[PDB]
DNA sequence: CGTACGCAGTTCGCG
DNA sequence: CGCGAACTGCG
């Protein structure tokens, strides 16, 4: 199995090394043979012999061209005559990329800017996590001493917890009397001892919780300190730090950091992001927090630290559980990519799309595209299109309706139509599929290159549905759900790729046509159920359309609705594929994008509404189900009133607890950047000020207290709120956050 | 580093 | 006030 793959120089020579693991142990192959390149195209062939003569400078000692190579190649399907440019070391590139791609024979030159590692991983057509073997985990955690306004790391770590199949341990410099942990005499030799716990055990996995902007950093600054040679890396390398715009990236050579903040994010949807809120999530079970100020007066009046190493003990067990489930997913995802799982877990859905293209694209010998310059990329910013359609839904009670949605939409349109770049206007086809509205002609006499692509991971991501239904245990179903949703966004994303203004393969016309069809075969299929089989479709949303049949029981909209599946799915071309989601007993549709319905289990499902939306509080969420419930299982508005005024009357008590009014809210950029300064944004600047870090992505949790003007002028963090000195706003909860979700629902 | 558009809903400043 | 802008998140 290949782990992760990097490069060293020797005598100014790239090795590429590969971290392998095979028959259990570690092993380390290196490669002293791959020579960097990158290709140039040009006007006229004789001005390859003053292209060999272009050099730049690098650290004081030249750099030249040190071989040449006429290759032939297809740009987007078309032949394509390049030049490959041979280098000695792979940083010699970007010292004379911009050089070379200015000589005035030059036209453009492209592929300067893979890593050469990830190069390496492309061109030999190597796949990471692919074989029979088991890695070794371990996670862990850190408990530090915090004040406010001290700088980071300032403080002294606390304890070090570990966890894998033997259990979990901490690590601590003062007298803990607990069965699990290890008393040690000072902090320096606590990280010299975790330091030789993971040299023993030796582990090609290493769980962390957000530990690449925390935990790997604070024991850096430390390790700075009080001089330790933290050699976590299989090579003695100490893990180095990354930095990937506004978040940190730490890696350790050998083994895999498995860093749990970024996967849990692309994979579950929730309020708040701590630790306890997702070990709740994923196995149900509660997870108990000690506080940054707790474990301060813990430690310096030295009462109470049974307490906190039960938290730094959990805050291991919990995150090697919960690696312990992730891991095969991100496995599976850099098997599909082709990246190592230290890449594929940080990247979100344009690198995951770019890096298989790319593979792909060298196995076909299709010569990339470059990445857009910032003019570009700007320009494709501003640059938009019309995307699905949404019906105004039809207002009131209605009985008895199905929901039908088209299986994989967008994937299925780009492969049935061939919505390629190397596509779109092709000239000399015998056969085309114009699109409407937007009037994009795409060529079918091949298959196109993305089109091609997008068929095996639709395969992939019914293969684990198909596993999902066989699969009894609600664990195991749990996780294959988190699995297929994440395959459907990456097929869905290869649509957006189209669109995304940094991508290589950057083809506007193909995502304006995606939308095209999609609006097209939703409208159509719409009118097909309306005219044809007597249905009335009330809400309808790019792919799916809630419909009953007027006074129709269950059974017979039921069977009406499977016997338009295959009418409409006869009618339809290729893999186009209406699906059936599902009966409703009874639904509501208040406005777009915002809908309630209750089905033949008297479960309540619901879209967009305050419920499902992280921006409001428990109280509020609460108390929405529970007129949910009243209106579609009990169907009585009175009691429904009834409920709200019980709620209402007791926020006005005080009688509901903190930790059901907490409305959280992310921060989606750098606090100055801001223009318009919110409840969320009033809390983050405050933490910035004395300190605590605020990146983009971090949920604000904040509490309302009492007080007139501004909702952010009297907003502190939830974990500030003390109830003996707090008193959070009875009215603002009552007539901003409890009244307008339920008051318009019962506006029907 | 950074998939797409559509759109309901809130906080804030202000005339 | 309540539109207009900034802002968020869901589908
Ligand atoms: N995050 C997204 N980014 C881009 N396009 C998307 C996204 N989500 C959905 N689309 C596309 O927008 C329309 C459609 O959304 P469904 O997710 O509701 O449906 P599937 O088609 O994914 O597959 P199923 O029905 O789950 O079997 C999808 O094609
Ligand atoms: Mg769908």
Known sequence: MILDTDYITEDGKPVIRIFKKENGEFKIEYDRTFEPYFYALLKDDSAIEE???????????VVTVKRVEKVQKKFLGRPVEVWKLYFTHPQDVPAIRDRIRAHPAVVDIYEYDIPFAKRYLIDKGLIPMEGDEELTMLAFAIATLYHEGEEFAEGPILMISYADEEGARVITWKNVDLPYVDVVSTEREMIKRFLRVVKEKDPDVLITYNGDNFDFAYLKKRCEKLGINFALGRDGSEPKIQRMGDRFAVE?????????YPVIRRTINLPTYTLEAVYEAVFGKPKEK????????????????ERVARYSMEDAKVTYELGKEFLPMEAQLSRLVGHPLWDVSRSSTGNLVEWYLLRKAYERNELAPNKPDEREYERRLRESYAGGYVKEPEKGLWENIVYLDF???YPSIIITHNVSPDTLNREGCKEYDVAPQVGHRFCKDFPGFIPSLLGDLLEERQKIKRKMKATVDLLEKKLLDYRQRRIKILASG???????????????????????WGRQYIETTIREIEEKFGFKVLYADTDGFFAPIHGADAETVKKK??????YINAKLPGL??????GFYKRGFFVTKKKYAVIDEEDKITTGGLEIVRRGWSEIAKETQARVLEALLKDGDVEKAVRIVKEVTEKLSK?????????????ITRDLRDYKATGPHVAVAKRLAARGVKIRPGTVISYIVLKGSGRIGDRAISFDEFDPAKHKYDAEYYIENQVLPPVERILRA
């Open 51 to 61: 292209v060999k003569k272009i050099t730049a400078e690098r650290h004081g000692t």
């Open 252 to 260: 350790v050579k050998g083994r895999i950091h498995f860093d749990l």
């Open 290 to 305: 000690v506080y940054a100020e707790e474990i301060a007066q813990a430690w310096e009046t030295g009462e109470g630290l």
């Open 407 to 409: 299986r994989s939409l």
């Open 494 to 516: 290869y649509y957006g790729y189209y669109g995304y203004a940094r991508a290589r393969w950057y083809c506007k016309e193909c995502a304006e046509s995606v939308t095209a």
């Open 561 to 566: 609705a499977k016997e338009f599946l295959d």
């Open 576 to 581: 186009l594929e209406l699906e059936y989601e």
């Open 654 to 666: 005080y009688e509901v607890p903190p930790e059901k009014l907490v409305i959280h809210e992310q």
